[PDB]
Design a binder for this molecule. Structure first.
Ligand code: EP2
Lengths: 205, 48
């Protein structure tokens, strides 16, 4: 009944203090909470003209060389505008999709696998070190580099590569970064805290 | 639980699972991880 591109714009601009601080970072569980309290409208990629509120921040080169301009490390949080783009129907208020639950999954590899297996992809977070930026393929394992900060991502599966167990992960740095926008990271030993902040939730049917 | 598992292959009727977005020049990683998984989930649990 619904295959919708949920708006990142709506979450980023209208959640407020409960999710943290817009373009200056925030809280994953806070975001799932917003989905259950205020809901989220549809919204596609930068100028796709898809949905109620498409993303308004242009795509850029994330730690790689490409044809788009280079990213400039966080800019300003855009306004919380409660209207859909021109030509879209229905209105903002009626294009809202609500979640019916928001919860945290324990730091336990098996419980995280069960959650993904039964209910779908989850959101997690990990400490990004300098060596991760150049990731291309294989299973990532932090070797060296200075701490750059925390990073929230989508975990959508797992596997074993060359005997090394990993989590299949979708980054949000476009497709010219890493393995077509995805990467694998060591699973089983809370590597860079990948298993420590898993959050998820269920849609209102 | 199976040794391997790829959500893209398991729910082929849900294209968002394969999609990669671009957060642009903004620390909105927290919002993206959420909306992306929420999109996958709305599709996976399409009522009942
Ligand atoms: C209750 O919790 C606390 O007190 C700690 N939380 C806080 O202080 C606020 N949240 C955060 O700082 C989260 C932490 C995360 C572990 C949940 N970061 C974020 O939301 C963002 O700063 C995610 C992000 O977008 N990171 C950047 C920086 C990189 C180095 C990871 C990024 O991907 N960028 C920024 C520019 C575009 C893109 C890029 O570098 O390619």
């Amino acid at each position: 009944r619904v295959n919708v591109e949920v708006s990142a714009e709506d979450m980023l601009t209208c959640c407020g203090g409960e999710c943290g601080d817009g373009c200056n970072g925030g809280f994953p569980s806070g975001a799932w909470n917003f989905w259950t309290k205020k809901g989220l409208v549809s919204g596609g990629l930068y100028n796709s003209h898809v949905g109620c509120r498409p993303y308004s921040i242009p795509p850029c080169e994330h730690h790689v060389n490409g044809s788009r301009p280079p990213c400039t490390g966080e800019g300003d949080t855009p306004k919380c505008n409660k209207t859909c783009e021109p030509g879209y129907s229905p209105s903002y208020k009626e294009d809202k999709h609500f979640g019916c639950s928001s919860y945290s999954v324990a730091n336990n590899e098996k419980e995280i696998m069960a959650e993904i297996y039964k209910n779908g992809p989850v959101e997690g977070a990990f400490s990004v070190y300098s060596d991760f930026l150049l990731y291309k393929s294989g299973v990532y394992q932090h070797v060296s580099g200075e701490i750059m900060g925390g990073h929230a991502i989508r975990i959508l599966g797992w596997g074993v590569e060359n005997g090394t167990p990993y989590w299949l992960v979708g980054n949000s740095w476009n497709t010219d970064w890493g393995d077509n926008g995805f990467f694998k990271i060591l699973r089983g030993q809370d590597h860079c805290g990948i298993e420590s902040e898993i959050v998820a939730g269920m849609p209102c049917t | 639980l199976p040794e391997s598992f790829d959500a893209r292959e398991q729910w082929p009727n849900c294209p968002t699972i394969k999609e990669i977005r671009d957060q642009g020049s903004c620390g909105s990683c927290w919002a993206f991880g959420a909306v992306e998984a929420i999109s996958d989930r709305i599709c996976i649990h399409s009522n009942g």
